[PDB]
Amino acid sequence: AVLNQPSSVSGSLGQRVSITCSGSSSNVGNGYVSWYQLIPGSAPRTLIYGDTSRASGVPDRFSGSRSGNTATLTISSLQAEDEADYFCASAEDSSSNAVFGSGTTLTVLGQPKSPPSVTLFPPSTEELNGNKATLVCLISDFYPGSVTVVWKADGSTITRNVETTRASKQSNSKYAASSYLSLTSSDWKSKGSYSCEVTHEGSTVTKTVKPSECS
Amino acid sequence: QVQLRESGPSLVKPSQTLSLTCTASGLSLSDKAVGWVRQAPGKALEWLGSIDTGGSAGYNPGLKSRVSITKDNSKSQVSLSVRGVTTEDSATYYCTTVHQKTQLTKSCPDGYSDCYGCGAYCPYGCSGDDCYSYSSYGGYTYSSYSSTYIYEFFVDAWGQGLLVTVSSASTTAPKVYPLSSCCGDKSSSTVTLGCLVSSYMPEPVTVTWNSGALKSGVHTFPAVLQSSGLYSLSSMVTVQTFTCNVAHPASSTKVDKAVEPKSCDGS
């Protein structure tokens, strides 16, 4: 029912990687296998059909092959934008009964480190009219994709009512995230300054807003 | 060329019937069936079925009892129905064009080589048949092609997809608040503005700026989920008027919010 792929695979920038798709005589052994690329937040893209034929607009760096009940997708001269989930697919018994592979997440190693860009937004005058204040920390352009977020007011660390997203893939194959500090209107005005401190690969980037000077 | 677009409700109650529609158009539609593929949050791609030019529908055997696929050529639309849905049916649903064809394929029988690719070693009897074999026992034997069927399948084109959530919970439309930097912020020639899409459920929402006319310098962030069960996300612009267009399909709400930098005027 499933075509077995490795859950995850890694390769170096500028080198080659291979993803396998193993099945039985009914599917992969049938000799017509397709491959698809899925970049999160994007429509799937067909890469290969009929074992070795490349779909339109797919460069020769992508290559398909098959030996018995196991097909492999081979990507050469790996680039950052090749980071995606790759699925094999095949027909089984019928040409209108498709089986998909379990999927493989590809990581391209060896890309440069990138510090995060941080923007801290204060609560709006409209929101504070409802006695609530949402501080918004927007974090973009960091690789690798992992940051730790810390909120502070007047030097003290705040843990209450903090909610932070996981890092998500941007359009440029880098990562983005956000953190939200939820306060009452009185909490917002009662402190001299709030800070959003974003730590990435041991380095911290900080932005700060002052309520009394926010107008 | 192909254009595939999915439409239908983003939220469906358990045990009800999920109904979706795909509006297809383009010269590249011909020779192709229109199919439906879904992907649940942590799962792989799953095939649902398709309807071909001949007007017949084929289905995933595991879902045939619950799935129905029809077409309305007067509207150039193909429909999908899933009966008795559970939370297992929450997924992103893709409209596709599909290639499906059973092909008769000729190959040499076991142990025989092709008489066309023997170079200068071809036996003379190759003139009468397609394949040949040799054993030091009985010498050269000959044979015709064997015939097998090869079932071809591949998805050609994909739609953008539509997210459907199966749940019995109601919706909450978002509030849109403007985002602008503090007046006491250290300044630069770059202005950061944004829109806070706050406290909605369920997913998704979309954000554009100035009805799509403004795109460069626009960064929209995936949502956070609070303890209340409500989502919130923000979209920011870096650089006139600035209007963010927020759409929340599950509640049938569209919001236009004009955003200005802080005047820092006493006003």
Numbering used by the authors:
A (entry chain B): 2 to 9, 11 to 217
B (entry chain A): 27 to 265, 272 to 299
Give the original sentences from the paper that presented this experimental model:
Each of the knob structures starts with the conserved sequence motif [CP(D/E/A)G(Y/W)], in which the initial cysteine residue forms the first disulfide bond with another cysteine residue in the knob, and the motif forms a type I β turn. The compact globular folds of the knobs are maintained primarily by several disulfide bonds, a feature that is similar to the core of other small disulfide rich proteins or domains such as voltage-gated sodium channel antagonist mu-conopeptide, CnIIIC.
These four knobs could be described as two-layered structures with the three antiparallel segments as the first layer, and the additional structural elements packed against the first layer as the second layer. To examine the extent of this flexibility, we superimposed the heavy chain variable domains of each Fab molecule in the asymmetric unit for antibodies BOV-1 or BOV-4 in one asymmetric unit. The stalk orientations of stalks of Fab copies within an asymmetric unit for antibodies BOV-1 or BOV-4 significantly differ from the rest of heavy chain variable domains, which superimpose on one another. The twisting angles between the two strands of stalks are also different among copies of the Fabs within one asymmetric unit, suggesting that the CDRH3 stalks could undergo tilting and twisting motions due to their inherent flexibility. The superimposition of knobs on these Fabs within an individual asymmetric unit indicates that there are only small structural variations in knobs, suggesting that the knobs are structurally stable.
